[PDB]
Design a protein around this ligand. Structure first.
Ligand SMILES: [Ca+2]
Ligand SMILES: [Ca+2]
Ligand SMILES: [Ca+2]
Length: 129
């Protein structure tokens, strides 16, 4: 048996008026413990490959496997140029004395998505590629 890394809720919306992709990070659930104490200090990292210098982060939530994020993030790119891009939503356990530990991620290849209407999804977290 593989255990699940965690369930993540998020939203995609293309804002045609402002010309931006809106990524909303709503919450996570049943995240994995990456501290010995049996909890984590989760935060999500969000960016739009192949561009990796434009990287956002959520606030860190001390000690919880069911964080409520509630943050929205913007990427200025035209609906047409959104093609070959993949959206990465990377959950991490903040460790103050060392590398922060990867919990898991969701990668959304933007080519495959319907974005006429807005979208709200839950996705299982997968290990890094
Ligand atoms: Ca840790
Ligand atoms: Ca930690
Ligand atoms: Ca660590």
């Amino acid at each position: 048996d593989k255990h699940e890394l965690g369930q993540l809720q998020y939203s995609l919306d293309y804002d045609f008026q402002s010309g931006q992709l809106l990524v909303g990070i709503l919450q996570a659930m049943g995240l994995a413990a990456l501290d010995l104490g049996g909890s984590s200090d989760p935060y999500v990292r969000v960016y739009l490959l192949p561009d990796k210098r434009r990287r956002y982060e959520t606030k860190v939530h001390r000690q919880t496997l069911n964080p409520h994020f509630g943050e929205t993030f913007a990427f200025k790119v035209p609906y047409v140029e959104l093609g070959g891009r993949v959206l990465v939503m990377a959950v991490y356990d903040f460790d103050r004395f060392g590398r922060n530990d990867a919990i898991g991620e969701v990668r959304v290849p933007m080519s495959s998505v319907d974005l006429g209407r807005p979208v709200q999804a839950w996705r299982e977290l997968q290990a890094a590629p």
